[PDB]
């Protein structure tokens, strides 16, 4: 085994490799939304910018798990990144609702990864998940929730409300 490995269970190592793929997949979803909102027949530059940034952050999240894997002496195994579930995301509200659902799915996976680390008595992994992932996930979910509510207030259908709310994200 690796000269650095210590108190790092095979199951944690494998679960990290799957979370890497999930972070890369979410980055890919957000990239698809981002350029969907730059179509000439959608033209929502605030939504585009918001999802482009979310795409970058998710790819950074994947890289932090890749650095982590190497740090503990695990070995990174990357799988194919699935095509996004959709090619068209509808209105801003529907994209946000899809992002909300995706963020809570990522959160579920992260909490299961914390349970695996806790079960294998890995406080260093539980610390990483709490400090770097669980905290950021809850803030993201709250922020997307706020945005959904604000957009429902402003007028969620393809109208003046969507146009004005889009300016808030620019």
> Using the rule CB under 5 A, which residue among 8, 31, 61, 68 binds Fe ion?
61
**Is position 72 an interface residue for Fe ion (rule: CB under 5 A)?**
no
Q: How far apart, in whole angstroms, are the C-alpha atoms of residue 156 and residue 92?
A: 8
Binding mask 26-65 toward a copy of itself (x if CB under 8 A, else -) reads --x--xx--xx-xxxxxx---------------x---x--
> Using the rule CB under 8 A, which residue among 14, 53, 60, 70 binds a copy of itself?
70
Within 111-130, the residues that bind a copy of itself by CB under 8 A are 111, 114-115, 118, 121, 123-124, 126-127, 129-130
Q: Which helix (H) or strand (E) holds 145?
A: helix 135-154
User: Which single residue is written with the structure tokens 């992994």?
Assistant: 125
Query: 131 labelled as ligand-binding?
Result: yes
Query: 122 labelled as ligand-binding?
Result: no
Q: Which is nearer to Fe ion, 61 or 72 (CB)?
A: 61
CA–CA distances in Å: residue 111 to residues 39, 80, 94, 125, 127: 36, 23, 26, 12, 12
Q: How far apart, in whole angstroms, are the C-alpha atoms of residue 31 and residue 54?
A: 8
Q: State both tokens at 35.
A: 């350029």
Q: How far apart, in whole angstroms, are the C-alpha atoms of residue 170 and residue 164?
A: 10
* Cβ pair 21, 78 in contact under 8 A: yes
**Is position 85 an interface residue for a copy of itself (rule: CB under 8 A)?**
no
Write the burial class of residue 98 (CB in 10 Å: 0-12 exposed, 13-18 middle, 19+ buried): middle
> Using the rule CB under 5 A, which residue among 39, 152, 153, 157 binds Ni ion?
157
**Rule CB under 5 A: which residues touch Ni ion?**
140, 157
Annotated binding site, which residues?
23, 57-58, 61, 103, 131, 136-137, 140
**Rule CB under 5 A: which residues touch Fe ion?**
23, 58, 61
């Amino acid at each position: 085994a690796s000269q650095v490995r210590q108190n790092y269970h095979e199951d944690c190592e494998a679960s990290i490799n799957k979370q890497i793929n999930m972070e890369l997949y979410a980055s890919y979803v957000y990239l698809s939304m981002a350029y969907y909102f730059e179509r000439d027949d959608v033209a929502l530059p605030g939504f585009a910018k918001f999802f482009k940034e979310s795409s970058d952050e998710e790819r950074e999240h994947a890289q932090t798990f890749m650095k982590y894997q190497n740090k503990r002496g695990g070995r990174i195994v990357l799988q194919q990144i699935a095509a996004p579930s959709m090619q068209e995301w509808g209105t801003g509200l529907e994209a946000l609702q899809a992002a909300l659902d995706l963020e809570k799915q990522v959160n579920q996976s992260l909490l299961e990864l914390h349970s695996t680390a806790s079960g294998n008595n890995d406080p260093h992994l539980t610390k990483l998940l709490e400090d770097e992932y669980l905290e950021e996930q809850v803030d993201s979910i709250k922020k997307i929730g706020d945005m959904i509510t604000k957009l429902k207030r402003a007028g969620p259908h393809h109208g003046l409300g969507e146009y004005m709310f889009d300016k808030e994200l620019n």
